[PDB]
């Protein structure tokens, strides 16, 4: 193996129903959240590079790419952000899933708008509105490349990854549900990016396919 399995420390089930009962009607939100996460990690590497420019030896270009693949039924979002160590990976998709759900449910009960979801650290899980499964590949300067994977059931895996090296950053592959292929269409992606992510301060490039 060298594959490790972790049980969700929270009810990810409770998070998932909250996300359904909050965004099922506007699923395109997932793109906003993932792009927003990318921008966050890009801000971090930018910031660290100011004090230590050798942080950029793993890649100088700071960007976000979107890659639909109809044949595979995947939407992939790549960024050249700071990436996650193994511990960052578990902290951000596991640990925070518990405390961030708790925090976000409290704020919603007190009247906060749903659009705050990203601020409670659980925006990533909106991906499960469109994806049956999600793989996260990540690389941080201070660690090896890892692959995280979950169908948002009771568990997720982490493994040392041995695919193509990214130099630094994070790639999220959405294995879309059969009924949500619309997020593979160029026009659709474009509209969502225009609508939600126009103020993102890094270039966001859609890779259109040939047909
Ligand atoms: C420890 C240093 N590493 C990073 O922080 C990092 N590196 N890559 N990413 C990253 C993560 C995701 C999701 C899988 C969680 C992503 O879609 C894209 C990313 O670049 C991240 C990342 C980790 C967490 C988040 C979530 N931020 C919530 C935060 C809460 C307080 C308000 C401001 C925003 C967003 C991006």
Author numbering: 15 to 225
Kindly provide excerpts from the paper associated with this entry.
In this work, we present the structural characterization of hHsp90-NTD in complex with JMC31 through X-ray crystallography. In the hHsp90-NTD–JMC31 complex, the main moiety responsible for the binding in the ATP-catalytic cavity is resorcinol, a chemical motif shared with radicicol, a known Hsp90 inhibitor. The resorcinol is entrapped within the active site, where the hydroxyl group in position 4 displaces one of the three conserved water molecules known to play a crucial role in substrate binding. The phenolic hydroxyl groups, one nitrogen atom (N2) of the triazole ring and the amide of JMC31, establish a tight network of bonds with Asp93, Gly97, and water molecules, which are reported as key interactions for the inhibitor binding and activity. The resorcinol hydroxyl moiety in position 2′ establishes both direct and water-mediated interactions with the carboxylate of Asp93. On the other hand, the resorcinol hydroxyl moiety in position 4′ is involved only in water-mediated interactions with Asp93 carboxylate, Leu48 carbonyl backbone, and Ser52 hydroxyl moiety. The nitrogen atom present in the aliphatic linker between the aryl and the terminal cyclohexane forms a direct H-bond with Asp54 and a water-mediated interaction with Lys58. The terminal cyclohexane ring of JMC31 is exposed to the solvent. Despite these different arrangements, Lys112 points outside the active site when either JMC31 or other ligands are accommodated in the ATP-binding site. Our investigations are in line with what has already been observed for nucleotide binding, and confirmed that Lys112 in hHsp90-NTD, corresponding to Arg97 in protozoan parasites, does not intervene in the binding of this class of compounds.
